[PDB]
Amino acid sequence: VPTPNQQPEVLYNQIFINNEWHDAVSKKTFPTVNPSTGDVICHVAEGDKADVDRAVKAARAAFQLGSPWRRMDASERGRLLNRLADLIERDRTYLAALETLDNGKPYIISYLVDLDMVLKCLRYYAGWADKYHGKTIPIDGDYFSYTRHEPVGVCGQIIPWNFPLLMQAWKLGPALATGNVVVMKVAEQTPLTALYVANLIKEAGFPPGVVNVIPGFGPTAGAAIASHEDVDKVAFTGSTEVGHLIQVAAGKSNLKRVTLEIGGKSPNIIMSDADMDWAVEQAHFALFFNQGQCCCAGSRTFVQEDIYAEFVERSVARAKSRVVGNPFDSRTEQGPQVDETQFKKVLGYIKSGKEEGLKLLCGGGAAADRGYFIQPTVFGDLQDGMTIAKEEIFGPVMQILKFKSMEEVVGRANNSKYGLAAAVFTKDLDKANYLSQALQAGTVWVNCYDVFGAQSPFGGYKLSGSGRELGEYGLQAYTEVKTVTVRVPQKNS
Amino acid sequence: VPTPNQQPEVLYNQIFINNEWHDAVSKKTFPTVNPSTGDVICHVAEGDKADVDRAVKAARAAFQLGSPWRRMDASERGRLLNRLADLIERDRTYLAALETLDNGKPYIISYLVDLDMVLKCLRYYAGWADKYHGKTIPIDGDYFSYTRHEPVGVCGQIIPWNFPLLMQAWKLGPALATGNVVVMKVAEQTPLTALYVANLIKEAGFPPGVVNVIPGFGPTAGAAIASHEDVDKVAFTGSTEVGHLIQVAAGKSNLKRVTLEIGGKSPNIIMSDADMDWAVEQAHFALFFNQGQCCCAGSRTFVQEDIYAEFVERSVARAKSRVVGNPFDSRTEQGPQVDETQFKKVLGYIKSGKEEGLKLLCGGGAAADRGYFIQPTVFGDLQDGMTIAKEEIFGPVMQILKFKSMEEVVGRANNSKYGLAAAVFTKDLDKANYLSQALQAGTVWVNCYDVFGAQSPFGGYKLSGSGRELGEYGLQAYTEVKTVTVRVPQKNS
Amino acid sequence: VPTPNQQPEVLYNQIFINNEWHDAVSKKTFPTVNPSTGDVICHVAEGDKADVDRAVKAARAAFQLGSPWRRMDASERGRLLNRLADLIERDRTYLAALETLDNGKPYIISYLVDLDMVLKCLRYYAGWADKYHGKTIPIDGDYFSYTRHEPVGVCGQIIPWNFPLLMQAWKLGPALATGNVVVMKVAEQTPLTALYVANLIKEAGFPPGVVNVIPGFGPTAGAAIASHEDVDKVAFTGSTEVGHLIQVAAGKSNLKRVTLEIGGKSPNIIMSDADMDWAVEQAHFALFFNQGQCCCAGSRTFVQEDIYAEFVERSVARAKSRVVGNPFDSRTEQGPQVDETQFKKVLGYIKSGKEEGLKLLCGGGAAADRGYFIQPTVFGDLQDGMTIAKEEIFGPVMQILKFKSMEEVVGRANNSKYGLAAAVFTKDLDKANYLSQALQAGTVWVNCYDVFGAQSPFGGYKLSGSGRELGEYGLQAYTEVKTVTVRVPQKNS
Amino acid sequence: VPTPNQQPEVLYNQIFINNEWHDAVSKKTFPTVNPSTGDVICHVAEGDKADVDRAVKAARAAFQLGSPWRRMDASERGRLLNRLADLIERDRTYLAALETLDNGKPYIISYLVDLDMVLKCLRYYAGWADKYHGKTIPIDGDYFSYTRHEPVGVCGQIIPWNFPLLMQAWKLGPALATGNVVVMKVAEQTPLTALYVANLIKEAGFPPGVVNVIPGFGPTAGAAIASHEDVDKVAFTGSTEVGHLIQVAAGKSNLKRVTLEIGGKSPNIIMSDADMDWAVEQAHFALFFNQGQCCCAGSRTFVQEDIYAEFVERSVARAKSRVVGNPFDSRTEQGPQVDETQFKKVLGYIKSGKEEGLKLLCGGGAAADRGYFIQPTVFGDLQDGMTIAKEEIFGPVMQILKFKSMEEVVGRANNSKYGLAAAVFTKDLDKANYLSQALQAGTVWVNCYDVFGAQSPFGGYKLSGSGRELGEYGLQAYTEVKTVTVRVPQKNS
């Protein structure tokens, strides 16, 4: 991993529309802070409805029948996405550093993890461009019926702050590969990286209006996209709470297609025959990865009584050794929480746990007085009715529960409004197969956690989502099907 | 076509839950009238939220992991659907008669069209049961990734009164084929046939709770389903106005998956090179089919100026010969409108057209003093800004517009909030191919209209829908995708 | 299981062509014996080249563009296959008895196993008829490209005597479902059941020439089909030796498509952690099922040394209790071998094993002096270089080998010219996953054996086959793809 | 188009095996001539059986379970193919010049056509690498069945001299994308370009033994591949005559999977309503493209009598203006024929035509006395029984036939042992649709010819092929399907 620039230059901080950078119509700007120091990095244009409106306008024009983008060969769409990937890889060190500066995650992670997964996603979707075929259907009668898989049109894509570059990649990959146009709203907590990539999109040679990125606020620029009368589809990734607002907004206006990737409270089930060493480490990772700021975090670690005590002791030790510090330091495992608000939220949950009557095994408090650092907390002897066992904490706060039977763990694990992911650690073939089938979750990992593949779909089962985001599935929501039934003189097989 | 019983006996008029018939919790009942005579056929149990909750409870139980339905082989689901089909064919004469008695459509149509289409739908989806495979994905790293296409769960399905039996079949086919459970709300205007089939479901051997049919009202039983906290998915077919309510209800509650098949104002484009005879008859059919009560009716007949006068003359003559009368009479082409409310609504539009300044060429008034018969009306010299040229009439009221160029007709045809279907009549290959691509419609018929195939998807492009209902596509909405990623010792190709 | 007729009446014994029965052009006939008594059941017309030529002509005519069969709706093809199924189910008892009479397998098996699987196969492919879509391809340039999945044409299908009715169904299901025409060559050892079904094909309403069944001899009628200049595809199931002849014949003449389902020497690997009881019973079934006359029989039972002794002991006991006798007797587990030739071949192998220096644990000799009964033989302490450990025996002769490591068992099990199937018994997830990937077999069963599903493909990896026979894959070989590229005025997404 | 080097340097002329260049075991070499001058360009190592044997050895080793290539992520296979493309694009000018030097085709074509198509093919298949999923199948019983799409293994790929780089690309694309290993035999008449690309494969980072290219002769190196006991699959592109040999070879030995892309006599049907200008130009292109050395050439131009005379005179004029000359000259439309042998063959056919009694409209003789140039010949008034109207000429010799009805032209056009491609020129929708369905051809072009898309399959219907080469279909033949059926505690939907 190349040595990063601990203070990477901010080159873009405006609104990107027709491959052009401009200030908000209001000339208003908002600050973007560095979670590690609490100091302001710079100021970014604050997009609002007026800016969304013009971006939508730009996108619609780019999507007109006869446009360079609509006339473009699917293969060329693939070429553009691969070119974009190349530019991102060329600027990998810079983007990794900026990602960390704006977000807080360890540089090594932004480089080896975030950026690699960003490149793999775009590279993956580049190949789908000319392969998502329609169908020729053996309909009854003397007809020739077939389907066209056309773009759904103008897509509003709202993304969170936990994986800035990756979330952007997950949206643009399938949308662009299918021929759609994008009006994207990026998180006000982390707008810098998305904007830089927006310029690379221009450099890649994408036609104007195809991708418009608008930095701003949620109830402001986000809501304007969700309720716009000319946005054909919305893709939102964030809280279930806001997820509700997105669907409600869609219904109250355009009846635009909606997909949601939202919260979670994922159960990580360790069976007594599981390899302790692997299970403990993976359990640690399952919850602590990315400052605990992952929607599919294993926030409910169910451990079989027979091995509970040992598993708990080992988890606490591992939590005790987890290095929290400067993201740019090679030995830093944990950076700060994205912002003060989240910092307080997490702390509020730790307080709740202690008050609910939970066994605090690892220090649950601030880890520093400068950035938003919190100590890797671990709560043992957790009860299902406890707030921290029910509500998504989104911080470095581990919950460890105890169970006896499979029948019991299935019911407990499944008894949640969420269903984003789950995990099973066991050496037994039958337990693995039984559980993976019984678990009501979009993804079930067996003997592993947080394993993402651009080729494998991801999504929620209940109030944790709607629709899937990767693989071939990720193309479905960005496709509008048209049936064309032509009358023929005489149909033959 | 066998001789029908002009007065078929009503055997079921209650609420169907766990394969059992019972009155509404309130014991309240509502009348179902015969549109031909205006007299009450009988009374049906009026389901409400209390009944909906009971049905959902029943359905959820039937969906329990380990249930006969969930443990059932996919092939067996296919066998049950085929058995159902057989029972409907056994009772084809009776059902065609009852369909007409409660709806008003001609008996010949109910028999040869509706029932045939019903049988073909179920028979088609019966074969999909064991064929909608998941995937084994070549994910990165030492893992074995694959997806499971599981049922979405408890599905709420709300259907209209235009095609009682068929609408029911379009919903049950894909749902049952996939392993889902149903809580269906039937149109209060036409609940009889759906209830009869509900009993056939029981007789076919479907496990209790798998299909629950609730007769009742919209804002009552319908809304109860749309905002239910335990319904995983909603499939609604009706007005766009209500469609909005369904999507808003889903967002404000459960975040349940939603699909909508709604209104339309489909354009029927006749090019100057089209075969007049065919074009004229097909245009007649395109709009007048089923008392004009079809979501995909060719409500806007655009005819190229060069052949406009001739086409109009021929249209009016054909409309003047259209026989309106007793649905059970062999020579009846048009029966009455479903009910007085729709009778008045259609008349209101005829009034509107005359006042908008439209050329009434065919008598626009009631055709009788007993049932809800309206005369096949034809309006010539229509203008895009005219109410009847923008709002869905849902009655035997034809609109004929005049155009010159293709660029012109595409823009005009496309300039609508709707996009359910469209049609183009021409002998030219390039115009056919150009137009089918340019028209923003879920279905584009070329040299034909109203051609439906159980194997070809159907749906709307704008405020006329979301999702497709037939073919393989119809299975998508009834499937929940689960990704299972297993860590393996050493992955190889 | 209904009481069978020990002496079922033979109603059809001639050549079936245009839905008509006639004697061979030579008037020659051959006898069909009853393996249980060694007595002649009756005589069947002996088809030859002249008869094959006539059949091919009939088939070709039925395949003419514009034929009732080619113009028929795909759904109707489905209907015919379901009708056929129903007729077979109606005559289930008769067919099961006749199957046993002519083949030797126990009636219970013929009824509950063979017939059920025949019904399931036809009923399964009936549903594929109108679902095997082609595709609309996003090709470069201003074009509309799409593919048609047309029938391959006239298909020659040659089947064996081990599962008469079943093998017939495996060929007809996919062929007919895709719109092809068939010229079938049935095994001289067991032509009876296939002939009766041929008449059911007539009764089902299949167009004349669509299915022609020709009873006769291999180098006679079989070779005539394989080398015919007007047969578009050949599907052969039998010995690898003859498989070679089919491929060579195809090349020396028509260059017709070829698919082969041939011999095997499947390894059944029992890991030390396997459940003894289950593993022992399944191992017994794996090899002894259908008088050991199954191409995917577990001919090489590799058992982990730690559990070898015990496994062997249990295997011998189970083989010693295996009831051999009258197929019509409820307690008979094993009937006779198909005929004297096979009877002597199996005996020759037992002799070989004894001479090779193998430990005969179970009596290896004739079990009676009337029919072709052989005692369930079990050879312990087998060595890979032994003939019975290399050549397919096709009889009730079990081989039990000893192994130590997984690396060793993989190499040993894979060290064969065959690769039809394999099995792995273990409770460990990793071993299951590892082995199933490492084994070069068309089918790898884990914790079970001989599990067939009409929905899952089956075939060989080396000299044991080419192509797969069930599921969606089974339709591939019966499809000819046509690409139609149309120049369009302006292509858009 | 950049200025080429009229004399590009030959850097590789040996056998490429484990990413290493070596002389044949025999030290024998053969000359490669320049068709334009008749002079020897250089000498190339003459591979033989011994060289094929070692190449297969290398390939097998590269295919061992646990190999870098087998363990490699499918996505990485995609990366390698994209890298290879980049290298080819980097060297596009050199490769196009060398292609023309050794082949004879005009440099502008090699550059703008051949190399573009080469890049597009590899770029296309690079995206398929991680998307050709297997399936999870809803089999009956308590099991989990799924399929694995594994590589077929060692693939022997034999290619022709008409499109050296492109044929190589059509083979390597699908093979490598699927994870197979290759032993390729390149045409003795044109081995240079294929060898240079072989080195780029090394530079790209492909693991040793994955692609082995062997220059040599047909009955020598080609036959050794076709009958090799360790080659799992053979892919051959060439004459139907040799095609027979490949299939017979496969049967006589390994029973290896075979696919054939062979000869043709494609009919180009011009209906009276066709746009003459376009039809005439396209007709010229259809047959004259690449010195008439294309298997899909429109060898039989059927013209409707009403427009026959005009079409004929227009064709002759166009043929009279076709510039034949130095391939490197910007004005050259036609270069020389690949070699003296082909030179003589084509001339022999012209002689035949004259003798069969055909109307020679354009000079049918040599165009120069240096290279292998032949004058663009046009034969009018041809009859179906004439040799030139039956046998593939593979030279600039056009055949123009006259027809009256559609019924007539379908039968005549279809009356051939070949069925590679066909074309229909008409403005009529019904004629287009009717003919496309009626024509027994692997590809039917409507109002265009020789339109190839890496995304759409290509192949023959009779003695012109077996299997398809492009699109998703091209992956089928390079995949071996394995079914894994696991016993599960309790199967649920």
Burial (CB < 10 A; 0-12, 13-18, 19+), residue D407, is exposed
Nearest Cα residue in chain C from B437: C492
Residue B319 maps to which CATH number? 3.40.309.10
Q: Do C481 and D243 touch (CB under 8 A)?
A: no
Tell whether B186 is covered by a domain.
yes
Tokens describing residue D136: 């999870």
State how far residue A350 is from chain C, nearest Cα, in angstroms: 38
CA dihedral C98, C104, C107, C108 (to 10 degrees): -150
Q: Do C489 and B78 touch (CB under 8 A)?
A: no
Tell whether B472 is covered by a domain.
no
Are A310 and A409 in a shared domain? yes
Instruction: Label the pairing between strands C443-446 and C421-425.
Output: parallel
Are B6 and B49 in a shared domain? yes
Residues of C with CB under 8 A from a CB of B: 74-75, 78-79, 82, 120, 123-124, 126-131, 133, 144, 429-430, 433-434, 437-438, 454-455, 472, 486, 488-492
Q: Do A130 and D488 touch (CB under 8 A)?
A: no
Q: Rounded distance, CA B234 to CA B345, Å?
A: 28
- Domain limit, last residue, from B263, B279, B306: B263
Q: Do C255 and D240 touch (CB under 8 A)?
A: yes
Burial (CB < 10 A; 0-12, 13-18, 19+), residue B25, is middle
CA dihedral D295, D301, D302, D308 (to 10 degrees): 180
Q: Rounded distance, CA B104 to CA B356, Å?
A: 30
- Domain limit, last residue, from B242, B263, B284: B263
Are B193 and B48 in a shared domain? yes
CA dihedral B202, B208, B213, B215 (to 10 degrees): 100
**What domain count does chain B have?**
2
State how far residue C293 is from chain D, nearest Cα, in angstroms: 22
CB C215 within 8 Å of CB C52: no
Q: Rounded distance, CA B391 to CA B356, Å?
A: 13
Extended beta strands in B257-347, E state: 257-261, 267-270, 300-304
Are D116 and D144 in a shared domain? yes
Chains that touch C (3 or more CB pairs under 8 A): A, B, D
Tell whether B488 is covered by a domain.
no
Name the residue facing C146 among A136, A429, A447 (closest C-beta): A136
Query: Which of B402, B397, B404, B412 is closest to B367 using CA atoms?
Result: B397
- Domain limit, last residue, from D263, D287, D304: D263
Burial (CB < 10 A; 0-12, 13-18, 19+), residue D229, is exposed
Are C270 and C409 in a shared domain? yes
Q: B138 a known binding residue? A: no
Tokens describing residue B45: 């149990």
Name the residue facing C492 among A71, A135, A178 (closest C-beta): A71
The CA angle C437-C443-C448, to the nearest 5 degrees, is: 95
Enclosing domain of residue C367: 264-453
Chains that touch B (3 or more CB pairs under 8 A): A, C, D
Count H helices and E strands in chain C, helices first: 16, 20
Q: Rounded distance, CA D230 to CA D181, Å?
A: 12
Tokens describing residue C320: 């010693």
Look at phi and psi of residue A215 and say left if phi exceeds 0, alpha if psi is from -120 to 50, else beta. Answer: beta
CB D378 within 8 Å of CB D400: yes
Are C285 and C230 in a shared domain? no
Are D235 and D149 in a shared domain? yes
CB D419 within 8 Å of CB D261: no
CB D297 within 8 Å of CB D289: yes
Burial (CB < 10 A; 0-12, 13-18, 19+), residue B345, is middle
State the DSSP string of C174-186. HHHHTT-EEEEEE
Query: Which of C258, C256, C278 is closest to C424 using CA atoms?
Result: C278
Residues paired with residue C134 on neighbouring β-strands, in sequence order? A136
Tell whether C477 is covered by a domain.
no
State how far residue D471 is from chain C, nearest Cα, in angstroms: 9
What three-state secondary structure class fits B4? coil
State how far residue A480 is from chain D, nearest Cα, in angstroms: 21
Direct distance between the N- and C-terminal alpha carbons of chain D, in angstroms, rounded to an integer: 59
Chains that touch A (3 or more CB pairs under 8 A): B, C, D
Are B133 and B42 in a shared domain? yes
User: Alpha carbon B385 to chain centroid distance?
Assistant: 28
Are C227 and C355 in a shared domain? no
State how far residue B3 is from chain D, nearest Cα, in angstroms: 40
Give me the active site residues of C, please: 261, 295
Tokens describing residue C452: 């067939």
In three-state form (DSSP H/G/I as H, E/B as E, the rest C), the secondary structure along B70-103 is HHCCHHHHHHHHHHHHHHHHHCHHHHHHHHHHHH
State the DSSP string of A111-177. IIIIHHHHHHHHHHHHTTTTT----EE--SSSEEEEEEEEE--EEEEE--SSSHHHHHHHHHHHHHH
Residues of D with CB under 8 A from a CB of B: 65-66, 69-75, 129-138, 140-141, 146-151, 178-179, 426-430, 432, 446-447, 490-493
State how far residue C318 is from chain B, nearest Cα, in angstroms: 32
Tell whether D153 is covered by a domain.
yes
CB B115 within 8 Å of CB B235: no
CB A32 within 8 Å of CB A216: no
Are D253 and D338 in a shared domain? no
Q: Measured on CA atoms in the order D217, D223, D226, D231, is the torsion positive or negative? A: negative
Given B46, B99, B261, B333, which residue is catalytic?
A: B261
Are B253 and B202 in a shared domain? yes
Q: Do C71 and A491 touch (CB under 8 A)?
A: yes
Cα radius of gyration rounded to whole Å, chain D: 23
Nearest Cα residue in chain C from D140: C453
Q: Rounded distance, CA B33 to CA D288, Å?
A: 74
Indicate the annotated binding residues of A. 159-161, 185-188, 218, 238-243, 261, 392-394
Nearest Cα residue in chain B from D146: B136
Q: Rounded distance, CA D72 to CA D77, Å?
A: 7
CB B452 within 8 Å of CB B296: no
Tokens describing residue B93: 């004469």
Phi, then psi, of C387 in degrees rounded to 5? -50, -50
CB pairs under 8 A between C and D: 187
- Write out chain D residues lying below 8 Å of B66, CB-based: 490, 492
Tell whether C476 is covered by a domain.
no
- Write out chain D residues lying below 8 Å of A78, CB-based: 123, 127
Mutate to test the interface with B, among C83, C84, C130 (most CBs of B within 10 A): C130
Tell whether B468 is covered by a domain.
no
Tell whether D476 is covered by a domain.
no
Given B121, B155, B294, B295, which residue is catalytic?
A: B295
Are D192 and D272 in a shared domain? no
CA distances D135 to A120, C158, C266, D211, Å, are 23, 29, 24, 29
Resolution (A): 2.7
Residue C132 maps to which CATH number? 3.40.605.10
Q: Measured on CA atoms in the order B242, B243, B246, B247, is the torsion positive or negative? A: negative
Indicate the annotated binding residues of A for NAD(+). 159-161, 185-188, 218, 238-243, 261, 392-394
